[PDB]
Ligand binder design. Sequence first.
Ligand SMILES: [Zn+2]
Ligand SMILES: [Zn+2]
Lengths: 89, 145, 357, 212, 240, 127, 35, 102, 39
Amino acid sequence: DEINEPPPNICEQCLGDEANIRMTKIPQGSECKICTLPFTLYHFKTSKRSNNIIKTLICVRCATQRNICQCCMLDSRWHIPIQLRDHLI
Amino acid sequence: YIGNLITRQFEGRSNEIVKTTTKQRLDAYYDLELRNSVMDDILEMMPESIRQKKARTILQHLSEAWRCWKANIPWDVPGMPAPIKKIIERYIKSKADAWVSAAHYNRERIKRGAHVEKTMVKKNLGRLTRLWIKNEQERQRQIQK
Amino acid sequence: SAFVNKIFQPEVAEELIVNRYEKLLSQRPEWHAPWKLSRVINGHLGWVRCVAIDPVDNEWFITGSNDTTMKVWDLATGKLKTTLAGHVMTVRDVAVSDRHPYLFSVSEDKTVKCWDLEKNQIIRDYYGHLSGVRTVSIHPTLDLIATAGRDSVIKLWDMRTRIPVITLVGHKGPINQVQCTPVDPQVVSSSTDATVRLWDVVAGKTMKVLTHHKRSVRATALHPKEFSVASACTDDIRSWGLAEGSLLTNFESEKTGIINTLSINQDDVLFAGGDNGVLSFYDYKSGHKYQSLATREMVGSLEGERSVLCSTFDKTGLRLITGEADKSIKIWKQDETATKESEPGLAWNPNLSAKRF
Amino acid sequence: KGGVWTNVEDQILKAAVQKYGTHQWSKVASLLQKKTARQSELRWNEYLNPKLNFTEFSKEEDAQLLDLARELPNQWRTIADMMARPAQVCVERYNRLLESEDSEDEEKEMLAEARARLLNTQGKKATRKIRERMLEESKRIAELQKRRELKQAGINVAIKKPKKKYGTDIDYNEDIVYEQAPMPGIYDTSTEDRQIKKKFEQFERKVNRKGL
Amino acid sequence: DILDLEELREYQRRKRTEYEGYLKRNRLDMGQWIRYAQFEIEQHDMRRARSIFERALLVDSSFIPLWIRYIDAELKVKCINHARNLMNRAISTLPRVDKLWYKYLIVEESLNNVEIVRSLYTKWCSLEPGVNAWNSFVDFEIRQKNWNGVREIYSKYVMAHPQMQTWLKWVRFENRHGNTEFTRSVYSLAIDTVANLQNLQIWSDMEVAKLVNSFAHWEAAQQEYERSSALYQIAIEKWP
Amino acid sequence: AILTDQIAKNVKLDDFIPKRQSNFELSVPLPTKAEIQECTARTKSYIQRLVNAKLANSNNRASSRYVAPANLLLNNSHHIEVVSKQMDPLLPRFVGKKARKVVAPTENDEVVPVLHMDGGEADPNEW
Amino acid sequence: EHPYGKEVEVLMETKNTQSPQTPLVEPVTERTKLQ
Amino acid sequence: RGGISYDQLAKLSYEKTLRNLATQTQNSSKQDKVQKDTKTGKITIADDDKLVNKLAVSLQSESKKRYEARKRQMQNAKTLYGVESFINDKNKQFNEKLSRES
Amino acid sequence: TSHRPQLEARSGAKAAAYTPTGIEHARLLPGHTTLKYRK
Ligand SMILES: [Zn+2]
Ligand SMILES: [Zn+2]
């Protein structure tokens, strides 16, 4: 479905501390790092005066199947890497 | 035009190229639709236990019947089931109605001089000489009977 | 009776083989008047492969055929009105619009075409089927058409913009017949994988898969009242209840062999055209085959040519236009001055040997 | 120049018709030197067809032949379809029936060539494919032997992969491909997977020692 | 022959490229699917070997040799719980097919799980499949000596197939065991149901004659000739 | 009778039996006029939104002629304005869009029962 | 003589009875024009 | 005469393996549950590992026995008939297939 | 071999999962943009 798409999965610590964040949506932006298939690239900045753009690197389907955010690809709960998550379980 | 060229550079060409039917391949697409209709009607007459092997052999009696029609040879297979022989003769007569009517249509075009391909003049000659002898052989049998 | 329920004490009291059978004998099918041939129209150069009626005012019907040309025939007199050429292979299905002056026609040449009936010219061509297209259905009050064929998909076309809007991907074989209903399920399709699908067109997925037929489901037909579809395989015809997907009734079609077409009347008469030439009329609410006729081909033709290929009723329902493989168009009149007496039809006699019920 | 039919040319013509049918005679006559396609077509239809009956006529067939030859004088191809005999048989009998009122080595070479031609049914593309397949099998065996000999000398060199012909070409060894998992079932196949993993790891442990 | 694991790893790539090539050209040809699925069993990788049979079932799930071979592949490697899930999907997809039901049975027969074949047969005889299923279900309880259970089956079997060769099979059961009190109870139930359901017209004239005669010739062997004689009068009057 | 349900659950005897055989006069009603309108306006709006997706994404300039921000994230802990970037008319829009081919997996969660009837099965060698 | 038994009307049509430009549906012209 | 349908063939195959399981128990006798985890929903059946092994062995023995009964049929039918002209083995199997038609 | 009949046709199931290209065809250009409705 190209007209019904999920909202992106991003961490709280990627978004940071500020309340309102101006995020830019590009409907077929870059292609996913994992599945190499295009998606809606969301990118944003923590503050207005920051100097680092935080992009979503993977699509929401690869982010849901691993339960990770799209930006830093850490787990949505516990905020740990995937290799350490699957080792603790 | 150039917009189609540059997007074909950046993205490649599509993999869903469906070819429309043309004068070039209308004889090719006719037989694909003719073989599927014969393969459907026999598979529905079958009681059970027919696979990709038995559907493959029965379609060679369809090809053999049309070569017997063009030869004006009576197609009679000993041991052929009478429902299935009835199906093939229904579709050989159906293909013959297209084959003969295309020989009448293209003959009227060659007389008018109205853009007949050089291959089709040799093809329409080869059709009528089978139609002339088939009319000749039938006239011979009406005197003999 | 009550003896069966007290001795052979059931848990459902309907699912015994006798309690279902005693309710069929308790019920009598509706009488219907028999059918007779009234007109034979010989106008095509090949098989008549599809027939469509004028949905408004009922003056003409149109028969696409095997000689790549659609002819328009006047219903009353039987004369030929016009010929519509423009396909290069066999016209497989023809659908006339009730809300539009538009004629939709598919063929084996991979083309879906529209026709302005105020101009008799091809407008608004459709593109995208990988193989020959087999059926058209015009959606009531949505301005879509549904086309399907050998590609195992159903392309839902916007009329105005000519775009393949929705492709329905669930089948495994070539789709033989497709219907359009106003509510969900909006598309009913039948294919050679012995399935009838009920489609949710917004989600693009199947509501219900009807795997009750054994062989290729070659023909379906929508009932103009009472909101049901009937599908015909090579031996059985089954009426289906839409919005539940429920098997309504199982007809008395025994040794009819490949039903090629179906058409359902306002007066609950279902026609079943077979390849053997034997054409049979059923009670739609019961399944009782009350009449079985056979046709005469021509002066001279083959024995395979005796086969009904397509059929519709007219808007009044008192006429049946069938097109057959003998290049003919036969119109079947339901004869008046016949009563329940002296024309009873075949006797209502359900049996236990056939497990149909 | 017109040759006669020897028994070697007849049995090549029988074996060719049994190979090619009767509607391609320029392909039958290519096995036979000194015979045209028209000559081999006519020799079959007059002499070598097993449908033809070279039998003596009965007493009825003699009187029935004399009856036809007055009905159709003298139309011997038409009479021969009535008699279901060959036409030269019907004439030569009819003349005898009116006389009742009285008052190596070149052949062996072409036979070997025909025997080689009848028993080869493949074609260029099929034969070319067979040669190519044999070459590929030999190339693999050579490379494997080269790796075994270097393994005897201590140097370990890995097997090279076949290079990608296109961009999304698939290495089937790297990944289980379009894996379809068995549908989840109520029977809790948990210990079965442990035993199958243990047996599979045991198998691959035995391959690294015994070889296979 | 293969020496080490790297030569095996190059051997497995060459066959799997080959078989996946012919299956890409031919989605069909179920025999080609099984020969590649059998290849993966020989490589002892059952995770791959389950995948080809699953992919082949997505092409043609109505092909019965494909179901039996994948079931047998799970049984030969002793994965019994993988087979129970698989035969469950076999009978839930194709309930008509008798082979798939008998396959479930003779495996659970082989494991001496008598309560699972009994639960299987109760479901299978609920879908009204035909006389081959019931007759193998009454033969199952004779093996298990459950005489009270097999008598419950014929109570249901005559209601699923109302015909005298199912009723007379039940009196051939009872006269095999010689219980006189049970046999005439079945005989009384069989002749009343013909009378009770006379109007339905499902037993023919030759068919009801087998019930009256087998009732009478049994009563002749039970030395009660007056019951043998009187039933002939009620049957001739009841059916003239 | 230890596992009565867990065999062949998806298939029942009620799916085989017809419904009109118990009463021929069973009413299967046509869809009401208020019900056809609730489905028409849902379907027409879905397809018009699909046609507007195809006409906007096409690179023809003459297709605008023929034709959601402030979303919650992290259980609404962050209110996030979603904006669009002003695309360069000369750089290719949809940079991740290529003509590539994808094989799709099948989602088979429930088995569909192939509900044939039992079995007129005797046949000589005529076929 | 002719088949089907004289209740059935058999007709053989080889030519069109309308012009090709004849509209099969009459166009909806509500307002009358005098231009 | 005639052929045997698949529902009649499957019962006779089921009747035959019941006699193989009967004599297997008779040759053995001559010599001398259900747990349903509520959280997962899975059902575990505890059964004897001998009867599962004897199931796996007998399927392999029936697979090899039909493999050997067909291999000897391949070696016999190749060395029966050589009268009619052939070219390869696929021609011989086809010309023999024409003989069973008539 | 190499010259074969079709055992099955190419399905639209395969082309549905592909990514589109959006190439501009001359017969998909806008034309007859207004529908006519019957009285
Ligand atoms: Zn991804
Ligand atoms: Zn993150």
